[PDB]
Design a protein around this ligand. Structure first.
Ligand code: NAG
Ligand code: NAG
Lengths: 36, 31
């Protein structure tokens, strides 16, 4: 939108990043520091 | 913009093409 200027989308969507943080958060609530 | 997706010429010479943020009904199989 404009003249020669474009914006590229990020590779990870926001859904994917919220998935990543919920996996980190379920790992720590449930296993402590052992999963890292 | 137009981008070309290639597996590498040392694998194949087939190619796919991305027309960036263009509605796919006004470009000019698999669309
Ligand atoms: C590139 O080509 C060489 C010889 O033609 C082959 O040994 C090598 O595996 C090829 N690389 C890939 C990624 O296919
Ligand atoms: C492309 O145009 C058609 C016709 O109006 C429309 O139905 C379609 O939703 C458009 N593409 C996108 C991604 O919205």
């Amino acid at each position: 939108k404009f003249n020669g200027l474009t914006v590229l989308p990020p590779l990870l969507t926001d859904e994917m990043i919220a998935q990543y943080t919920s996996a980190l958060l379920a790992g720590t609530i449930t296993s402590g520091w052992t999963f890292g | 913009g137009v981008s070309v997706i290639t597996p590498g010429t040392n694998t194949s010479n087939q190619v796919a093409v991305l027309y960036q943020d263009v509605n796919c009904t006004e470009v000019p199989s698999n669309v």
